[PDB]
Amino acid sequence: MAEDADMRNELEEMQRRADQLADESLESTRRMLQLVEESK
Amino acid sequence: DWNFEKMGIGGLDKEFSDIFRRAFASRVFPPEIVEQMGCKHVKGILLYGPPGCGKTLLARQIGKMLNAREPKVVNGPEILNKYVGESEANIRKLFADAEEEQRRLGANSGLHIIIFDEIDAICKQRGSMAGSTGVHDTVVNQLLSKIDGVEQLNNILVIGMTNRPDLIDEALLRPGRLEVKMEIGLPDEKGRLQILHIHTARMRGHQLLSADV
Amino acid sequence: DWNFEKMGIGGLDKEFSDIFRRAFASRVFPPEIVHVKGILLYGPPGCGKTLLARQIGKMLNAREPKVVNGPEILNKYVGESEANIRKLFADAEEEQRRLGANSGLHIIIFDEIDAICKQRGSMAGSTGVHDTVVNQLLSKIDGVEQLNNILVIGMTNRPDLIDEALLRPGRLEVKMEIGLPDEKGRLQILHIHTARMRGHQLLSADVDIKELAVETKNFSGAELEGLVRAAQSTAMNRHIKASTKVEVDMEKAESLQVTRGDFLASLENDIKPAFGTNQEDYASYIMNGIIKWGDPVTRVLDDGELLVQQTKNSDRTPLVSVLLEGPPHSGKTALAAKIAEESNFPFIKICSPDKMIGFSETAKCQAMKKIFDDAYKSQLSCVVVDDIERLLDYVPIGPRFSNLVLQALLVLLKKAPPQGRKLLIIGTTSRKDVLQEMEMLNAFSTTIHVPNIATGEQLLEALELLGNFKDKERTTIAQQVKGKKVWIGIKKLLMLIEMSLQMDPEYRVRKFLALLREEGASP
Amino acid sequence: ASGIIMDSSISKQALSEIETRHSEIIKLENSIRELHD
Ligand SMILES: Nc1ncnc2c1ncn2[C@@H]1O[C@H](COP(=O)(O)OP(=O)(O)OP(=O)(O)O)[C@@H](O)[C@H]1O
Ligand SMILES: Nc1ncnc2c1ncn2[C@@H]1O[C@H](COP(=O)(O)OP(=O)(O)OP(=O)(O)O)[C@@H](O)[C@H]1O
Ligand SMILES: Nc1ncnc2c1ncn2[C@@H]1O[C@H](COP(=O)(O)OP(=O)(O)OP(=O)(O)O)[C@@H](O)[C@H]1O
């Protein structure tokens, strides 16, 4: 949809980025904690 | 490769002569005398009339004869957007390549055409409505500022058509913005004959028309 | 410079000098003996505001002026408008800090400032983006930190939309109105734009710039430039011929002289002033002049002259009225208009029912009241009412008429004007048998009579003054009308003369006499 | 008493605050992976 589609995609990808990257960071922290506890 | 006969417009012969006289006289003339005369080319055309005589056909054929870049079309009011202050972002995206090529190639730039279809949907009188939003005023202000602002832009040509001339705001029709304005109306006997001859050439080409017509 | 003209501007010389006096005087004045921050411009479209802004920026030796092209500050993200607005004054604040009161002057251009400034944003803006933006600008310009090295110029084509809050002292101090130039300004603009022509003698000597300046009325500079451009385009296209292909002689091209004919064609054909025109039609009430077919005309005109003299030179009779009586189709309106014209008074008007079709009683009363009220302003004036019987529409059945209009007329006929002023009233009517019944004939001071043609000699004299028949035709007319009565009005006589010139010459006189006999009668 | 009217609405993307910066935690995991190795 030209400019309309461009903006809709931009904002949808922005919400995506937010949620997905937050979840990925949470998973990374989980793995970090698990390995740190394992080494002991 | 151009000729008036190739164009399908018939019955509108004075109008085209006037448009050519008042719009393309300067560009065709050799540059030296033009510079010696120190004149500025026109930057607008307006067309109006009752529903359906020659408007869109004339605009398309005019845009299809210049050996310039492809024109940019705007089908009705497809500029509006639902986010705050984004109609302007779409308006300014039209007059974008023109400024860049003005900066790059000095004063030998080509010609850029913009065809505003149904211009009365966007550019109404300022403060006319009593609605709950004020996007139309900002759109009109941005268009007025960009068409002729402090920075001189002189390699564009804007064409507009409508069915209601009186609704346009006067500030958009002062000599310099949209000066040449024309009226297309019903034809007469010679015009009718020319039109019927234009639309019946191909059938007569291969003898598909009976002799008694 | 202060040339007032080297910048290609005209008509604002006095206001340009006033700007010099009121804006930059403090900067010009020596610092030993010792500002303006807000300048606003307004005027109708096409007057030269942007030219003033550009020349003002160029004139002073300061940094390059900054510009904003309409609403380039709005954004869809929260808080970006304020950041963009505050990005502007960083240099001003830094220079203030660095150089105290020696900071260089700064110029900020707000083109089409109406886009930002308005009476608050609409409720459906989802926030106060408009109000918060205007408040941020107001605080920055009028903050507690007071700078003296910034000048802001605003321009708009419609001042009524600017919020009043920004027009108070300390924000917008100077206001300028740019109006329509004058005849001398038109001459100056034409000279500026035709200097390039006159440099190479490409303009025909047949052109008189004074005539053009006289002709162009209510033209702004842009419209005059358009006229000149149209003339140039016509002159250029005279030498081009592009119907099969684009072609130019290239030999008979040097002449290329724009002639007065080109200017006239451009003015008449493809330009419009964009302003209305005043209409004058009072010459349409006398379409055939006045011819003295007899003595009575002289007496009527003499009485009118005496009445005018009395009203002018009287002391305790500021108001005078007269009635013009006569049979139908006798030419009473023409004589009344003539007598009004001969008075040479500053104010004259004609009240007729031709302009009131479909009006009710109240509208007629209001219109007559307006006309008389206007007439009550000049020192001495004359007013004429014709076809009274059609003003209070009267029909012999019943009879039926309008009471409100009759009472309005009877009240207005005996109301003196303000102290030391003179008014004259002339009324015309064909049937006086009714006005005497309504008691409206006693208000008028005096009455004059207008007769019909009553003798063959007068008819023949009128024919001669018209010059239609001759020789045996007139001789036979005389022979047949030297022992008969004639009762014809001049208008009816003209109608008959027009009627009888449609058949062949053999039957013309017979047809004319037959028509005269048919229409002839006695009182 | 004329009345009974309507209106239109617009919006604004107010969550401008960035989030990508705090999501680039991969390098710390890489370092601790090297430590575990
Ligand atoms: N003068 C003409 N010569 C040749 N063909 C014509 C002429 N006028 C109309 N036509 C034919 O009829 C069609 C009319 O459509 P056109 O694009 O001219 O409409 P329009 O004037 O833009 O209409 P609207 O009333 O919607 O503004 C043209 O495309 C062409 O097919
Ligand atoms: N008094 C004048 N002297 C010289 N040129 C003038 C004058 N008035 C108008 N013009 C011409 O008209 C144009 C002036 O318009 P400009 O672009 O400076 O802004 P403006 O008149 O404020 O515009 P707007 O119509 O948008 O309010 C230029 O072409 C200028 O040559
Ligand atoms: N000496 C004259 N006196 C009056 N009218 C004259 C004379 N010579 C020529 N005319 C023309 O005769 C016509 C007079 O018509 P006019 O409308 O004045 O008549 P009227 O008697 O007032 O009409 P009505 O009966 O319709 O009220 C006008 O064209 C006037 O120019």
PDB file of N, CA, C and O and ligand atoms in Angstrom, chain C residues 285-293 297 327-335 387 389 430 490-491 494, ligand 3:
ATOM      1  N   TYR C 285     -32.221  55.848 -18.816  1.00  0.00           N
ATOM      2  CA  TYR C 285     -33.551  56.422 -18.669  1.00  0.00           C
ATOM      3  C   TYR C 285     -33.859  57.478 -19.720  1.00  0.00           C
ATOM      4  O   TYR C 285     -34.999  57.948 -19.788  1.00  0.00           O
ATOM      5  N   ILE C 286     -32.879  57.863 -20.535  1.00  0.00           N
ATOM      6  CA  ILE C 286     -33.085  58.783 -21.654  1.00  0.00           C
ATOM      7  C   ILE C 286     -32.412  58.136 -22.861  1.00  0.00           C
ATOM      8  O   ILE C 286     -31.207  58.292 -23.080  1.00  0.00           O
ATOM      9  N   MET C 287     -33.190  57.398 -23.653  1.00  0.00           N
ATOM     10  CA  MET C 287     -32.657  56.660 -24.790  1.00  0.00           C
ATOM     11  C   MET C 287     -32.812  57.393 -26.114  1.00  0.00           C
ATOM     12  O   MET C 287     -32.255  56.939 -27.119  1.00  0.00           O
ATOM     13  N   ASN C 288     -33.542  58.513 -26.146  1.00  0.00           N
ATOM     14  CA  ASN C 288     -33.777  59.218 -27.400  1.00  0.00           C
ATOM     15  C   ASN C 288     -33.641  60.731 -27.270  1.00  0.00           C
ATOM     16  O   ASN C 288     -34.050  61.451 -28.189  1.00  0.00           O
ATOM     17  N   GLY C 289     -33.089  61.237 -26.172  1.00  0.00           N
ATOM     18  CA  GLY C 289     -32.898  62.666 -26.035  1.00  0.00           C
ATOM     19  C   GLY C 289     -34.214  63.417 -25.917  1.00  0.00           C
ATOM     20  O   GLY C 289     -35.297  62.846 -25.808  1.00  0.00           O
ATOM     21  N   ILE C 290     -34.093  64.743 -25.954  1.00  0.00           N
ATOM     22  CA  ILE C 290     -35.225  65.653 -25.826  1.00  0.00           C
ATOM     23  C   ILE C 290     -35.276  66.531 -27.068  1.00  0.00           C
ATOM     24  O   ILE C 290     -34.272  67.153 -27.437  1.00  0.00           O
ATOM     25  N   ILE C 291     -36.440  66.580 -27.710  1.00  0.00           N
ATOM     26  CA  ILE C 291     -36.667  67.404 -28.893  1.00  0.00           C
ATOM     27  C   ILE C 291     -37.836  68.335 -28.606  1.00  0.00           C
ATOM     28  O   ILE C 291     -38.875  67.897 -28.100  1.00  0.00           O
ATOM     29  N   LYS C 292     -37.663  69.618 -28.926  1.00  0.00           N
ATOM     30  CA  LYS C 292     -38.669  70.637 -28.630  1.00  0.00           C
ATOM     31  C   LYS C 292     -39.719  70.635 -29.737  1.00  0.00           C
ATOM     32  O   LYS C 292     -39.714  71.458 -30.655  1.00  0.00           O
ATOM     33  N   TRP C 293     -40.646  69.684 -29.639  1.00  0.00           N
ATOM     34  CA  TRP C 293     -41.764  69.616 -30.570  1.00  0.00           C
ATOM     35  C   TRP C 293     -42.803  70.699 -30.314  1.00  0.00           C
ATOM     36  O   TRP C 293     -43.746  70.828 -31.102  1.00  0.00           O
ATOM     37  N   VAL C 297     -42.602  72.158 -23.374  1.00  0.00           N
ATOM     38  CA  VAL C 297     -41.340  71.684 -22.814  1.00  0.00           C
ATOM     39  C   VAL C 297     -40.568  72.843 -22.196  1.00  0.00           C
ATOM     40  O   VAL C 297     -39.985  72.716 -21.109  1.00  0.00           O
ATOM     41  N   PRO C 327     -51.162  62.509 -18.934  1.00  0.00           N
ATOM     42  CA  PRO C 327     -51.783  61.269 -19.412  1.00  0.00           C
ATOM     43  C   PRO C 327     -50.736  60.223 -19.745  1.00  0.00           C
ATOM     44  O   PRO C 327     -49.542  60.539 -19.858  1.00  0.00           O
ATOM     45  N   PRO C 328     -51.142  58.967 -19.911  1.00  0.00           N
ATOM     46  CA  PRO C 328     -50.165  57.899 -20.146  1.00  0.00           C
ATOM     47  C   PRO C 328     -49.461  58.042 -21.485  1.00  0.00           C
ATOM     48  O   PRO C 328     -49.977  58.643 -22.430  1.00  0.00           O
ATOM     49  N   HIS C 329     -48.259  57.468 -21.554  1.00  0.00           N
ATOM     50  CA  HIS C 329     -47.433  57.512 -22.759  1.00  0.00           C
ATOM     51  C   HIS C 329     -47.172  58.951 -23.191  1.00  0.00           C
ATOM     52  O   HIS C 329     -47.281  59.293 -24.370  1.00  0.00           O
ATOM     53  N   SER C 330     -46.824  59.803 -22.229  1.00  0.00           N
ATOM     54  CA  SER C 330     -46.567  61.212 -22.489  1.00  0.00           C
ATOM     55  C   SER C 330     -45.126  61.616 -22.217  1.00  0.00           C
ATOM     56  O   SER C 330     -44.782  62.786 -22.408  1.00  0.00           O
ATOM     57  N   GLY C 331     -44.277  60.690 -21.779  1.00  0.00           N
ATOM     58  CA  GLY C 331     -42.886  61.004 -21.519  1.00  0.00           C
ATOM     59  C   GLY C 331     -42.682  61.882 -20.301  1.00  0.00           C
ATOM     60  O   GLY C 331     -42.244  63.030 -20.423  1.00  0.00           O
ATOM     61  N   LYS C 332     -42.997  61.352 -19.121  1.00  0.00           N
ATOM     62  CA  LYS C 332     -42.802  62.069 -17.866  1.00  0.00           C
ATOM     63  C   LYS C 332     -41.506  61.699 -17.163  1.00  0.00           C
ATOM     64  O   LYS C 332     -40.897  62.557 -16.518  1.00  0.00           O
ATOM     65  N   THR C 333     -41.075  60.441 -17.269  1.00  0.00           N
ATOM     66  CA  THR C 333     -39.823  60.035 -16.642  1.00  0.00           C
ATOM     67  C   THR C 333     -38.634  60.761 -17.261  1.00  0.00           C
ATOM     68  O   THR C 333     -37.716  61.185 -16.548  1.00  0.00           O
ATOM     69  N   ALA C 334     -38.630  60.911 -18.587  1.00  0.00           N
ATOM     70  CA  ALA C 334     -37.495  61.537 -19.257  1.00  0.00           C
ATOM     71  C   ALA C 334     -37.318  62.982 -18.810  1.00  0.00           C
ATOM     72  O   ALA C 334     -36.200  63.421 -18.522  1.00  0.00           O
ATOM     73  N   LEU C 335     -38.414  63.740 -18.747  1.00  0.00           N
ATOM     74  CA  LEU C 335     -38.314  65.137 -18.337  1.00  0.00           C
ATOM     75  C   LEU C 335     -37.865  65.256 -16.886  1.00  0.00           C
ATOM     76  O   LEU C 335     -37.068  66.139 -16.548  1.00  0.00           O
ATOM     77  N   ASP C 387     -43.536  56.552 -11.248  1.00  0.00           N
ATOM     78  CA  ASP C 387     -44.555  55.508 -11.251  1.00  0.00           C
ATOM     79  C   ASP C 387     -44.979  55.179  -9.820  1.00  0.00           C
ATOM     80  O   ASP C 387     -44.798  54.068  -9.318  1.00  0.00           O
ATOM     81  N   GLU C 389     -48.023  54.949  -8.685  1.00  0.00           N
ATOM     82  CA  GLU C 389     -49.132  54.002  -8.638  1.00  0.00           C
ATOM     83  C   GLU C 389     -48.646  52.558  -8.660  1.00  0.00           C
ATOM     84  O   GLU C 389     -49.339  51.667  -8.158  1.00  0.00           O
ATOM     85  N   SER C 430     -49.208  59.141 -13.494  1.00  0.00           N
ATOM     86  CA  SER C 430     -50.064  59.346 -14.657  1.00  0.00           C
ATOM     87  C   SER C 430     -51.536  59.511 -14.304  1.00  0.00           C
ATOM     88  O   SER C 430     -52.245  60.262 -14.980  1.00  0.00           O
ATOM     89  N   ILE C 490     -45.959  61.079 -27.536  1.00  0.00           N
ATOM     90  CA  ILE C 490     -44.726  61.022 -28.316  1.00  0.00           C
ATOM     91  C   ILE C 490     -44.208  59.592 -28.406  1.00  0.00           C
ATOM     92  O   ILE C 490     -43.738  59.152 -29.462  1.00  0.00           O
ATOM     93  N   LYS C 491     -44.273  58.847 -27.299  1.00  0.00           N
ATOM     94  CA  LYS C 491     -43.836  57.455 -27.319  1.00  0.00           C
ATOM     95  C   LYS C 491     -44.680  56.633 -28.285  1.00  0.00           C
ATOM     96  O   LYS C 491     -44.152  55.813 -29.049  1.00  0.00           O
ATOM     97  N   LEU C 494     -43.565  57.441 -31.794  1.00  0.00           N
ATOM     98  CA  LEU C 494     -42.366  56.698 -32.171  1.00  0.00           C
ATOM     99  C   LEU C 494     -42.705  55.249 -32.491  1.00  0.00           C
ATOM    100  O   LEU C 494     -42.196  54.681 -33.468  1.00  0.00           O
TER     101      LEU C 494
HETATM  102  N1  LIG E   3     -39.557  65.771 -25.767  1.00  0.00           N
HETATM  103  C1  LIG E   3     -39.604  64.548 -25.229  1.00  0.00           C
HETATM  104  N2  LIG E   3     -40.214  64.394 -24.034  1.00  0.00           N
HETATM  105  C2  LIG E   3     -40.265  63.175 -23.490  1.00  0.00           C
HETATM  106  N3  LIG E   3     -39.781  62.026 -23.966  1.00  0.00           N
HETATM  107  C3  LIG E   3     -39.184  62.207 -25.147  1.00  0.00           C
HETATM  108  C4  LIG E   3     -39.051  63.403 -25.834  1.00  0.00           C
HETATM  109  N4  LIG E   3     -38.373  63.211 -27.028  1.00  0.00           N
HETATM  110  C5  LIG E   3     -38.115  61.926 -27.034  1.00  0.00           C
HETATM  111  N5  LIG E   3     -38.576  61.257 -25.930  1.00  0.00           N
HETATM  112  C6  LIG E   3     -38.443  59.832 -25.653  1.00  0.00           C
HETATM  113  O1  LIG E   3     -39.744  59.333 -25.436  1.00  0.00           O
HETATM  114  C7  LIG E   3     -39.707  58.263 -24.463  1.00  0.00           C
HETATM  115  C8  LIG E   3     -40.570  58.695 -23.308  1.00  0.00           C
HETATM  116  O2  LIG E   3     -41.017  57.517 -22.604  1.00  0.00           O
HETATM  117  P1  LIG E   3     -41.312  57.547 -21.054  1.00  0.00           P
HETATM  118  O3  LIG E   3     -40.937  56.273 -20.411  1.00  0.00           O
HETATM  119  O4  LIG E   3     -40.650  58.786 -20.454  1.00  0.00           O
HETATM  120  O5  LIG E   3     -42.874  57.785 -20.991  1.00  0.00           O
HETATM  121  P2  LIG E   3     -43.990  57.854 -19.860  1.00  0.00           P
HETATM  122  O6  LIG E   3     -45.155  58.660 -20.271  1.00  0.00           O
HETATM  123  O7  LIG E   3     -43.297  58.290 -18.572  1.00  0.00           O
HETATM  124  O8  LIG E   3     -44.363  56.325 -19.688  1.00  0.00           O
HETATM  125  P3  LIG E   3     -45.379  55.403 -18.881  1.00  0.00           P
HETATM  126  O9  LIG E   3     -46.782  55.684 -19.297  1.00  0.00           O
HETATM  127  O10 LIG E   3     -44.925  53.975 -19.187  1.00  0.00           O
HETATM  128  O11 LIG E   3     -45.098  55.719 -17.413  1.00  0.00           O
HETATM  129  C9  LIG E   3     -38.242  58.172 -24.040  1.00  0.00           C
HETATM  130  O12 LIG E   3     -37.621  57.326 -24.998  1.00  0.00           O
HETATM  131  C10 LIG E   3     -37.728  59.578 -24.335  1.00  0.00           C
HETATM  132  O13 LIG E   3     -36.363  59.432 -24.696  1.00  0.00           O
END
